[PDB]
Amino acid sequence: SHMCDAFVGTWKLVSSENFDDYMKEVGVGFATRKVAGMAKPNMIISVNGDVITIKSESTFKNTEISFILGQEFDEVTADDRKVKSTITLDGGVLVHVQKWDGKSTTIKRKREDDKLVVECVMKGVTSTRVYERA
Ligand SMILES: Cc1oc(C2(C)CCCCC2)nc1CC(=O)O
């Protein structure tokens, strides 16, 4: 047993709040916001040694990142941003920072009851995305 045991699994989106505004703040254009906002992704989290993999799969896009905590990596996001990302564990929360074009967004993933809660923040705009086990 280890670092991320309670995150591992297959998770499905069950609720979203303020996601459109988050995507506007990030710079996502109209058509992508509409199609991406309709998606109902599954998030699949696995661990092998020190390497964590997070997949997002939906009718919009399928994405996958693999990383070591605290070790920066280049990421192409589902909306096609080229970002430099770093993911750390801070008090049991996975904290994922993306930097690009002098901008920054922070995405927190936490276990709360039987849910995996994803909080997406950019400047003053937050979106909360709630996932349950598949
Ligand atoms: C943190 C994050 O980012 C996204 C993006 C990249 C999807 C495509 C449109 C722009 C945002 N969704 C989420 C939320 C989630 O995975 O549920």
Which atom of ligand 1 is nearest the CA belonging to 120?
1
Q: What approach was used to elucidate this structure?
A: X-ray
Domain boundaries, the chain: 5-131
Residues 84, 71, 18, 5: what is their CA dihedral angle, to the nearest 10 degrees?
150
CB contact at 8 A, 96 and 83: no
Resolution of this model in Å is 1.1
Q: Which CATH superfamily is domain 5-131 in?
A: Calycin beta-barrel core domain (2.40.128.20)
Per the annotation, does 133 bind a ligand?
A: no
Complete DSSP assignment for 15-80: EEESHHHHHHHHT--HHHHHHHHH---EEEEEEETTEEEEEEE-SS-EEEEEE-TT--EEEE-TT-
Give, using CA atoms, the residue closest to atom 5 of ligand 1.
78
